[PDB]
Amino acid sequence: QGRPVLLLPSFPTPNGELHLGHLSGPFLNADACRRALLAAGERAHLLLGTVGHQSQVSAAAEAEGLSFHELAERNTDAIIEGLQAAGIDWDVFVRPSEPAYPAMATSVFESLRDRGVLVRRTEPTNYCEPCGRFLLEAFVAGHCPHCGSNQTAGIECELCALPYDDRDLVDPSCATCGAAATQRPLTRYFMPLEPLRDELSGYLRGAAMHGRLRAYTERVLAKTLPDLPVSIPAEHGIPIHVEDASGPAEQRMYSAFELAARFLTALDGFADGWEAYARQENPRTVLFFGFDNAFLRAFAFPAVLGAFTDALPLPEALVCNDFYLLDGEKFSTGRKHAVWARQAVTPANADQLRLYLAATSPDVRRRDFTTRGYAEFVTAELIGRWQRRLDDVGGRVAEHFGGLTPEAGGWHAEAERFYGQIKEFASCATLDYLPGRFKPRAVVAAACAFIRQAEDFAEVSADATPGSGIARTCAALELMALRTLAMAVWPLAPEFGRRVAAALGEDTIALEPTPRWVRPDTEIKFATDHFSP
Ligand SMILES: Nc1ncnc2c1ncn2[C@@H]1O[C@H](COS(=O)(=O)NC(=O)[C@@H](N)CCC(=O)O)[C@@H](O)[C@H]1O
Ligand SMILES: [Zn+2]
Numbered sequence: 001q002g003r004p005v006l007l008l009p010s011f012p013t014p015n016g017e018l019h020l021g022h023l024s025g026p027f028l029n030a031d032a033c034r035r036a037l038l039a040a041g042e043r044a045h046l047l048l049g050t051v052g053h054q055s056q057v058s059a060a061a062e063a064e065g066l067s068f069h070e071l072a073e074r075n076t077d078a079i080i081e082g083l084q085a086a087g088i089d090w091d092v093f094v095r096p097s098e099p100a101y102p103a104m105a106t107s108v109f110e111s112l113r114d115r116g117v118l119v120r121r122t123e124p125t126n127y128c129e130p131c132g133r134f135l136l137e138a139f140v141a142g143h144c145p146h147c148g149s150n151q152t153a154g155i156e157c158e159l160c161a162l163p164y165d166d167r168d169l170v171d172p173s174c175a176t177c178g179a180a181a182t183q184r185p186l187t188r189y190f191m192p193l194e195p196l197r198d199e200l201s202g203y204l205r206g207a208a209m210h211g212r213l214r215a216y217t218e219r220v221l222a223k224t225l226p227d228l229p230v231s232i233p234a235e236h237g238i239p240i241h242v243e244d245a246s247g248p249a250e251q252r253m254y255s256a257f258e259l260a261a262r263f264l265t266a267l268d269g270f271a272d273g274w275e276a277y278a279r280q281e282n283p284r285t286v287l288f289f290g291f292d293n294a295f296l297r298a299f300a301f302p303a304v305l306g307a308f309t310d311a312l313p314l315p316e317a318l319v320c321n322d323f324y325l326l327d328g329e330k331f332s333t334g335r336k337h338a339v340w341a342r343q344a345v346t347p348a349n350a351d352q353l354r355l356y357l358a359a360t361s362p363d364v365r366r367r368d369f370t371t372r373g374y375a376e377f378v379t380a381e382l383i384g385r386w387q388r389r390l391d392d393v394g395g396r397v398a399e400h401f402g403g404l405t406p407e408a409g410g411w412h413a414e415a416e417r418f419y420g421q422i423k424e425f426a427s428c429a430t431l432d433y434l435p436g437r438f439k440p441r442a443v444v445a446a447a448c449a450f451i452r453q454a455e456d457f458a459e460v461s462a463d464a465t466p467g468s469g470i471a472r473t474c475a476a477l478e479l480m481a482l483r484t485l486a487m488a489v490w491p492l493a494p495e496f497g498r499r500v501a502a503a504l505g506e507d508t509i510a511l512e513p514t515p516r517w518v519r520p521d522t523e524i525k526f527a528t529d530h531f532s533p
């Protein structure tokens with residue numbers, strides 16, 4: 001397949017900086033996926049941005065005193081710096097004020113309205129008379145009807161992500177003044193999703209996702225599908241005129257409806273013409289997101305995108321994660337419970353921190369970050385054992401082979417077994433970086449177990465008869481194993497992988513199931529200080 005791969009992590013909301021939970025979720029997942037795809041010889045492009053309108057930015061802008069626009073651009077700068085600190089690369093980044101964006105968003109609404117996909121509905125909607133505003137998205141507080149959580153923003157429940165109508169939010173209240181909501185009639189544009197039930201079912205049946213997300217899609221599809229809000233009264237946003245409206249006629253595009261337009265604006269800038277590129281290159285698209293975005297990315301995004309265009313296939317894989325915890329409580333921008341990326345990530349610890357977030361990847365469970373757990377990983381595992389193998393193999397190559405990589409001679413049983421272990425590690429790495437079954441956590445665990453297998457084999461190498469062919473084989477295998485480690489961890493620790501690679505005399509290592517020998521006579525000198533405690 002010569003198809004290019006589009007990696008589309010969630011566009012972070014520019015109401016703050018990124019914390020380590022963000023990194024541990026869609027951003028490290030998408031960057032490591034991209035890197036493994038490049039290492040396997042594919043074309044891979046990560047599309048990013050903070051473009052769009054989220055009501056959280058408007059609300060944060062009120063409190064902070066700034067305008068929506070100032071606050072989004074300021075936080076976009078900070079988000080960009082944290083991503084670069086963590087080694088997250090991108091092929092395009094769409095800022096909140098991208099001039100070509102509103103045309104794109106408007107094109108999607110008008111094209112859906114004109115083709116009959118949308119409706120205008122009038123219903124009683126929560127309103128705050130003292131504040132003088134309708135109570136929706138981030139401006140309403142209340143409880144999810146499915147799970148009872150109060151971690152909501154109108155139709156979005158952070159805990160279960162199960163959809164529901166605005167009028168179903170339990171115990172609504174003004175999120176600004178606390179007053180219990182009353183009501184007012186309002187007329188808004190909606191996109192019904194229940195007509196699309198068969199298309200969405202079929203689309204998701206053929207998409208790749210893990211079982212936790214699959215079972216979520218089944219719970220969603222076990223009830224009727226709410227209408228997706230399209231328009232909304234708000235101070236900021238892409239304008240939408242609502243005809244024959246009870247309530248304000250001049251409204252805005254609801255953020256959830258913007259998802260398709262955010263994607264295509266990014267692709268348009270990356271390709272200089274998104275629609276020609278889509279039809280001529282037939283890209284594969286891979287989504288990365290946290291579980292609070294599960295409805296938005298498994299349902300609302302394909303629904304809107306697929307009704308707008310067929311120039312590109314809908315995303316073939318959905319790489320969903322749960323929330324990273326900090327000392328047992330979720331990383332939270334709002335609640336200011338966080339370790340911030342700009343403050344904590346340095347060139348010296350980027351590789352080891354990415355390795356640790358992957359070793360603890362909150363893939364199907366919320367998992368915990370503590371500074372203790374992280375520090376012990378660095379010193380005991382990465383230094384105490386990964387660094388140790390490099391040194392042990394390196395110094396014994398110096399001691400017994402004049403620092404040159406020997407050429408494998410004959411074999412015996414212990415070499416068979418170790419080579420077979422090298423094959424199982426290499427195989428885990430090629431498979432578990434795949435978009436279709438992305439599990440970096442298993443690659444790190446396979447690395448740790450492999451280091452221990454290599455520690456056993458060092459005993460075998462130490463006891464081979466000096467000067468013999470089997471002694472050469474053992475050393476060639478020990479080098480082959482370190483070459484395979486650098487191959488296997490490169491997507492997560494690219495600087496560490498590149499440095500071990502160059503000590504083995506290679507500028508790049510293909511990501512592949514077949515282990516390779518180190519070139520005989522290659523001078524072997526490893527650095528002693530890859531990681532920093
Ligand atoms: N503690 C945590 N651990 C692990 N992942 C976490 C996380 N907190 C957030 N996330 C995930 O990080 C992604 C971005 O988070 S976010 O800034 O709040 N923005 C949003 O959720 C939506 N505004 C994205 C809209 C879009 O994609 O266009 C989102 O995919 C979110 O799910
Ligand atoms: Zn109020």
Ligand SMILES: [Zn+2]
Pocket residue numbers: 144145146147148149157158159160161162
């Ligand atoms: Zn819920």
